């Protein structure tokens, strides 16, 4: 992703 | 007429084919490999990168990257190689000539659709494109207009309530446990028996172990006491080199994390209680029709006994006189593709495509305007 997770 | 292409960018596999086909013509792991060793032999014929089954075959020599994780495309240069390989090598079809129906998981970043469109119109010059929610296609695939679709991939899990053909976008749950976090947990629990799987190529032995030998317990504590008390559940498998490894109570313990994400230290509730909490966000007139028509979808729902564990543990939550039914067709691994194949062949759909004229006029933002 961009925040709460690695992607 | 020219058929549309129908293409599904799973996290784990690409499924692709032509609309109106009953099953996908190309399925291969959406994986990109690069060589990680000194090139000793002159004149062998080097290659900068392998894709799909080529990267599976060589995988002892390669570092394997997945370019999608959690349904987000995390580097585009690999994903564009995967699409290039899909159109030109696996389907052997000119993308100049066919509409392309793509697919996406709900509630994911907006930029993913902008880029995923821009690359289709600039790079592949496709005539017309669409992007469709995964869980919507599983209803076309299962002959229904009403249901709550539980869909679980390699990278993402989501619930989407649909009643009489209307989606209920406030009730959509997304949950981020999937086959890859089952696999990474399975490596950690396999370490308890001394087997250690470390590298990216060696992870994908564990993925095949998970596929062959895992199953979901119908009472986690009773089968725990049994396999702690008996060899009867203990089963054994050959690694590629012929080493035998033996796997016991642990083989149910990894898919149990779908129902107890606290094993991974995840916050949320499991897929059952997120399903019930999704139905509790729907209007009370429709819950009786969402307690039937629980549709399983995607590969992470292929475990033996998962439908029974779902039906049991929703039946512990729902009121005692609602008829709980779980619907799990044996082809549910492909159901998102089958539903894309149906959707792309309807004549009422042929107005829905984003034509290149419209992308030229509007720019890629149009994909949000002309689409769910």
């Amino acid at each position: 992703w961009x925040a709460x997770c690695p992607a | 007429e020219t058929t549309a292409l129908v293409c599904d960018n799973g996290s784990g596999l690409v499924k692709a084919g032509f609309a109106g086909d009953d099953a996908p013509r190309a399925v291969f792991p959406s994986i990109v490999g690069r060589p990680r060793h000194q090139g000793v032999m002159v004149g062998m014929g080097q290659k900068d990168s392998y894709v799909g089954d080529e990267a599976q075959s060589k995988r002892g020599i390669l570092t394997l990257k997945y370019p999608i994780e959690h349904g987000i495309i995390t580097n585009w240069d690999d994903m564009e190689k995967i699409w290039h390989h899909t159109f030109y090598n696996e389907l052997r079809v000119a993308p100049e000539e066919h509409p392309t129906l793509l697919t996406e998981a709900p509630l994911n970043p907006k930029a993913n659709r902008e880029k995923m469109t821009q690359i289709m119109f600039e790079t592949f010059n496709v005539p017309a494109m669409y992007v469709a929610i995964q869980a919507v296609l599983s209803l076309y695939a299962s002959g229904r207009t009403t249901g709550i679709v539980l869909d679980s991939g390699d990278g993402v899990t989501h619930n989407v309530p649909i009643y009489e053909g209307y989606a209920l976008p406030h009730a959509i749950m997304r949950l981020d446990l999937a086959g890859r976090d089952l696999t990474d947990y399975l490596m950690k629990i396999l370490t308890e028996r001394g087997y250690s799987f470390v590298t990216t190529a060696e992870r994908e032995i564990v993925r095949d172990i998970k596929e062959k030998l895992c199953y979901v317990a119908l009472d986690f504590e009773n089968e725990m006491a049994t396999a702690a008390s008996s060899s009867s559940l203990e089963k054994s498998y050959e690694l590629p080199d012929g080493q035998v490894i033996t796997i016991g109570n642990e083989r149910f313990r990894c898919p149990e994390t779908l129902f107890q994400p606290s094993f991974i230290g995840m916050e949320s509730a499991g897929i059952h209680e997120t399903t019930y909490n999704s139905i509790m966000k729907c209007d009370i007139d429709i819950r009786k029709d969402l307690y039937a028509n629980n549709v399983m979808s995607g590969g992470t729902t292929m475990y033996p006994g998962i439908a029974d564990r779902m039906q049991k543990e929703i039946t512990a939550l729902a009121p005692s006189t609602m008829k709980i039914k779980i619907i799990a067709p044996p082809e549910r691994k492909y159901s998102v593709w089958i539903g894309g194949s149906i959707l792309a062949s309807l004549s009422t759909f042929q107005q829905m495509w984003i034509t290149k004229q419209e992308y030229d006029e509007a720019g890629p933002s149009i994909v949000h305007r002309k689409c769910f």
Binding site: - | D22, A23, P24, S142, R144, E331, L346, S347, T348
Partner: protein
């Protein structure tokens, strides 16, 4: 404007579509006083003029376009007087031959008359079907281009008997050492497999039969080739009230007592689900047990061996027994055939297949991706749809196989130089209830009349090029907007095939899609005022109301490949593997298979030159040689004759050769004015008689007239002839008066 005392006009009537009326007082530019039959009282209310009637010398002419006033009364009257009074059954309109079922036998078809027509041009003779066959045989010499005779009409109109005589003509004039015996002996087979009792009549043909008669380089007959199109596959499994399916099934059931057929374990004609449905197993006055024997004899004459005949009847008994396979549901999403199920046991015995393999494959379907393969249970509804689609697929392949063995006997080894082809196709249909079968029949008739209207438009453009006349004067009716409504994408068929594969599609949601897509977007599609489950199409002939109930059941074919591969595994007898020897075709719906078959027919016909025969049925009761106005007008609208006539009335209907114009109107033209050539004589005289040229044109070979001018010339001609009779009679009568008067003075 002509209306006077002692004029005649036609008036409408609910009993007979027009009444003759005598005009009793001259018209003044507002209500008309009329005498009638049955004494006289009328005053007749004009609306914000009555149709006007041809002088009695015209009525009964050989050619409906030779009338001076053209309208539905004049046409109906000419056909009525020619049929009832003169016992003439053949008539022309434009190029179109029009044929009326005398419906008792006649001398007219004798070989003397066949020889009398040979070599004659089409205007040299009174009309007859041999005049059309002869024009075909001429055009095939004048150009190598092949010729088609298109016979069309309602069921029972006489299309088959008209084809019979059309072929008898070619075989008498051309033919030599034989086709005739084999072709006529094929009819009981194609009638047995391909004809059914419809609601309105017995023995309706549900397919388009096309016979190619082949000729050599010297136009001797070589041989014949039979094609078939537009087979009504859906009748095999679904039947309306007091319909039947194809006769063969009932001839078979009626033969159950014969010792050959004991093994087939047949029952009575209402024991089977594919023959019980209509509630009317016996036709009045047909003994299916004897049509059986005439069928087997027709097979034997064409050299289908008794081994293959028993194969055919074994496969049909197979289909009949298949229809009785009953599925029990075990879940909303799964069904099974019950244990030891007798109909399936007998079916698998007949077909020689493992009972438990058919029992499995009937209830399951199979999918494979490239690597790996899956078996799905299916609902009881999808099992019943699949079984019906298998029965339809067997029947259609059996029909194509019988047609191929008939062709084996009809083909001949000499290389066919050219052919004349004869087509027996059902006409435009309208019934108190109309269903998907009628929607197909009417779409095929839209295509055929598009071809017809283009052919007529070409022919009269070419006549105007013979006559150096402007094309802009002529126009034609365009029915492409209705074809686009039926056939194009987002059309009525396309939204039907979509609704076959949308989940939980239904006739009720299909109808809603129709209304959403066309209701006020298209002028030719209309919703019936008091229903949501029907729609109206504005065809060329009439508005037709179609009922959505049970389109989708009729629309749907999908045959699961594993069931064909089970039948193809059969080892018991020769025929069943041979049927299926050479996909997307298994998916295609009945509507798409019909669209494609019709495109094959139109590719066959557009490569050819047509000549048309229209058949009309005088009466529904089979009364010999009597005529009903009310049916006949419906037929003549369904045949497009009335539109063609109206369109001609808009143009220049009446065309006189100058020498015939003189031969008629010498009384009009003075002994002084006539010239050393009659063409210039008439070119002057007509300008004397009619002040404005716009009423007429002068061609190279004919005078062309607008409608009505001939009746005017005949009126003034007859009044002048009576003035001449007044002169001559007055002179002779006055002489006799003088003679007797002066005798008295003497």
């Amino acid at each position: 404007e002509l209306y006077t005392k002692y004029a005649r006009v036609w008036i409408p009537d609910p009993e007979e579509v027009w009444k003759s009326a005598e005009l009793l007082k001259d018209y003044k530019p507002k209500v008309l006083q009329l005498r009638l039959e049955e004494g006289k009282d009328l005053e007749y209310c004009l609306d914000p003029l009555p149709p006007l009637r041809n002088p009695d010398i015209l009525v009964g002419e050989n050619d409906l376009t030779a009338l001076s006033y053209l309208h539905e009364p004049a046409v109906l009257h000419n056909l009525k007087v020619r049929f009832i009074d003169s016992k003439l059954i053949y008539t022309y309109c434009g190029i179109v031959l029009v044929a009326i079922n005398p419906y008792e036998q006649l001398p007219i078809y004798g070989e003397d008359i066949i020889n009398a027509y040979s070599g004659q041009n089409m205007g040299d003779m009174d009309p007859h079907i041999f005049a059309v066959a002869e024009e075909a045989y001429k055009q095939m010499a004048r150009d190598e281009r092949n010729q088609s005779i298109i016979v069309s009409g309602e069921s029972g109109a006489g299309k088959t008997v008209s084809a019979k005589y059309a072929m008898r003509y070619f075989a008498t004039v051309s033919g030599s050492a034989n086709v005739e015996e084999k072709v006529l002996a094929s009819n009981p087979i194609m009638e047995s497999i391909g004809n059914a009792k419809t609601t309105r009549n017995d023995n309706s043909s549900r397919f388009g039969k096309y016979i190619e008669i082949g000729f050599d380089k010297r136009y001797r007959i070589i041989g014949a080739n039979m094609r078939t199109y537009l087979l009504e596959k859906s009748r095999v499994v679904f039947q309306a009230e007091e319909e039947r399916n194809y006769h063969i099934f009932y001839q078979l059931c009626a033969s159950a007592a014969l010792p050959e057929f004991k093994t087939l374990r047949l029952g009575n004609a209402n024991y089977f689900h594919y023959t019980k449905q209509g509630g009317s197993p016996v036709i009045d006055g047909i003994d299916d047990a004897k049509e059986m024997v005439n069928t087997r004899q027709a097979c034997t004459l064409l050299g289908i061996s008794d081994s293959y005949q028993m194969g055919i009847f074994r496969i049909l008994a197979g289909i009949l027994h298949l229809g009785n396979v009953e599925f029990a549901s075990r879940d909303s999403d799964s069904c099974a055939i019950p244990p030891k199920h007798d109909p399936l046991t007998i079916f698998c015995d007949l077909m020689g297949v493992d009972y438990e393999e058919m029992a499995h494959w009937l209830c399951h379907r199979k999918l494979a991706t490239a690597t790996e393969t899956y078996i799905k249970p299916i609902s009881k509804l999808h099992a019943i749809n699949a079984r019906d689609a298998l029965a339809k697929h067997i029947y259609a392949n059996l029909f194509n196989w019988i047609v191929d063995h008939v062709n084996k006997a009809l083909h001949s080894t000499v290389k066919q130089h050219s052919f004349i082809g004869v087509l027996d196709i059902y006409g435009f249909e309208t019934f108190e209830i109309n269903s998907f079968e009628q929607f197909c029949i009417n779409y095929a008739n839209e295509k055929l009349q598009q071809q017809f209207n283009m052919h007529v438009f070409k022919l009269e453009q070419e006549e105007y090029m013979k006559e150096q006349i402007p094309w802009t004067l002529i126009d034609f009716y365009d029915n492409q907007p209705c074809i686009n409504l039926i056939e194009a994408k987002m059309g009525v068929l396309d939204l039907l095939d979509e609704e076959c594969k949308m989940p939980k599609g239904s006739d009720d949601t299909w109808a809603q899609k129709l209304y959403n897509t066309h209701l006020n977007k298209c002028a030719l599609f209309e919703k019936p005022r008091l229903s949501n489950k029907a729609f109206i199409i504005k065809h060329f002939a009439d508005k037709v109301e179609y009922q959505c109930e049970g389109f989708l059941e009729k629309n749907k074919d999908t045959v699961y490949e594993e069931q064909i591969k089970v039948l193809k595994s059969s080892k018991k007898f020769k025929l069943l593997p041979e049927l299926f020897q050479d996909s997307k075709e298994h998916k295609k719906t009945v509507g798409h298979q019909f669209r494609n078959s019709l495109h094959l027919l139109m590719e066959t016909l557009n490569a050819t030159t047509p000549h048309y025969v229209r058949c009309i049925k005088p009466n529904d009761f089979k009364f010999p040689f009597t005529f009903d106005e009310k049916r006949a007008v419906q037929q003549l609208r369904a045949c497009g004759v009335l539109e063609t006539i109206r369109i001609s009335a808009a143009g220049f209907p009446s065309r006189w050769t100058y020498q015939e114009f003189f031969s008629r109107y010498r009384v009009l033209m003075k002994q002084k004015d006539v010239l050393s050539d009659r063409k210039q004589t008439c070119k002057n005289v007509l300008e004397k008689l009619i002040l404005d040229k716009d009423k007429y044109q002068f061609g190279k070979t004919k005078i062309f007239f607008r409608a009505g001018q001939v009746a005017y010339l005949e009126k003034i001609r007859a009044d002048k002839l009576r003035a001449a009779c007044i002169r001559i009679q007055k002179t002779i009568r006055g002489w006799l008066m003088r003679k007797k008067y002066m005798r008295m003075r003497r």
